[PDB]
Amino acid sequence: SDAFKTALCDAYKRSQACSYGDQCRFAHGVHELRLPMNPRGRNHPKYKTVLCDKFSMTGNCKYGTRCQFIHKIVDGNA
Protein backbone atom coordinates (compact mmCIF):
# COMPACT_ATOMS: atom_id res chain seq x y z
CA SER A 1 0.00 0.00 0.00
CA ASP A 2 0.92 3.71 -0.50
CA ALA A 3 2.23 5.66 2.56
CA PHE A 4 -0.73 8.14 2.45
CA LYS A 5 -3.98 7.68 4.44
CA THR A 6 -3.64 3.87 4.93
CA ALA A 7 -3.33 4.43 8.74
CA LEU A 8 -4.54 7.07 11.29
CA CYS A 9 -2.27 9.88 12.62
CA ASP A 10 -0.82 9.06 16.10
CA ALA A 11 0.11 12.75 16.69
CA TYR A 12 -3.45 13.89 15.78
CA LYS A 13 -5.15 11.26 18.04
CA ARG A 14 -2.95 11.69 21.17
CA SER A 15 -1.47 15.25 20.98
CA GLN A 16 -4.03 16.73 18.44
CA ALA A 17 -1.16 18.81 16.91
CA CYS A 18 0.55 17.10 13.91
CA SER A 19 4.16 18.14 12.97
CA TYR A 20 3.46 17.98 9.17
CA GLY A 21 -0.15 19.28 9.51
CA ASP A 22 -2.15 18.84 6.23
CA GLN A 23 1.10 17.40 4.66
CA CYS A 24 0.79 14.44 7.13
CA ARG A 25 1.10 11.03 5.35
CA PHE A 26 -1.42 9.70 7.96
CA ALA A 27 -5.22 10.22 8.13
CA HIS A 28 -6.76 12.96 10.39
CA GLY A 29 -10.22 11.29 10.21
CA VAL A 30 -12.27 8.31 8.93
CA HIS A 31 -13.07 10.33 5.73
CA GLU A 32 -9.28 10.87 5.32
CA LEU A 33 -8.75 7.15 6.12
CA ARG A 34 -8.54 4.89 3.02
CA LEU A 35 -6.93 1.75 4.58
CA PRO A 36 -6.01 -1.51 2.61
CA MET A 37 -9.56 -2.91 2.22
CA ASN A 38 -9.43 -6.52 3.57
CA PRO A 39 -12.49 -8.81 2.70
CA ARG A 40 -15.38 -8.52 5.26
CA GLY A 41 -16.54 -12.07 4.28
CA ARG A 42 -16.06 -13.64 7.75
CA ASN A 43 -19.66 -13.74 9.14
CA HIS A 44 -21.73 -16.99 8.89
CA PRO A 45 -24.10 -16.81 5.77
CA LYS A 46 -26.95 -19.33 6.43
CA TYR A 47 -29.13 -20.58 3.53
CA LYS A 48 -30.24 -23.28 6.02
CA THR A 49 -31.73 -21.18 8.89
CA VAL A 50 -34.09 -23.29 11.14
CA LEU A 51 -33.51 -27.06 11.93
CA CYS A 52 -34.98 -29.72 9.54
CA ASP A 53 -37.94 -31.50 11.29
CA LYS A 54 -38.36 -34.19 8.56
CA PHE A 55 -34.62 -35.04 8.81
CA SER A 56 -35.06 -35.19 12.65
CA MET A 57 -38.22 -37.46 12.65
CA THR A 58 -37.77 -39.86 9.66
CA GLY A 59 -34.00 -39.26 9.27
CA ASN A 60 -34.71 -38.14 5.66
CA CYS A 61 -35.37 -34.78 3.94
CA LYS A 62 -36.71 -35.06 0.33
CA TYR A 63 -35.22 -31.67 -0.80
CA GLY A 64 -31.65 -32.64 0.23
CA THR A 65 -29.36 -29.76 -0.89
CA ARG A 66 -32.49 -27.68 -1.82
CA CYS A 67 -33.60 -27.83 1.87
CA GLN A 68 -33.90 -24.36 3.51
CA PHE A 69 -33.52 -26.14 6.91
CA ILE A 70 -30.35 -27.35 8.77
CA HIS A 71 -29.72 -31.12 8.43
CA LYS A 72 -28.58 -31.96 11.99
CA ILE A 73 -28.07 -35.65 12.96
CA VAL A 74 -30.00 -35.69 16.29
CA ASP A 75 -28.76 -38.26 18.90
CA GLY A 76 -31.20 -40.59 20.75
CA ASN A 77 -32.78 -43.97 19.78
CA ALA A 78 -36.50 -44.95 19.61
Sites of contact with Zn ion (CB under 5 A): 9, 12, 18, 24, 26, 52, 55, 61, 67, 69
Q: Which amino acid is at 47?
A: Y
Check: CB of residue 61 under 8 Å from CB of residue 54: yes
Q: CB 35 → Zn ion: shortest distance, Å?
A: 15
Q: CB 67 → Zn ion: shortest distance, Å?
A: 3
Looking at the Cβ atoms of 2 and 38, the one nearer to Zn ion is 2
Q: Which amino acid is at 67?
A: C
As a whole number of angstroms, the distance between CA 13 and CA 29 comes to 9
Q: CB 38 → Zn ion: shortest distance, Å?
A: 23
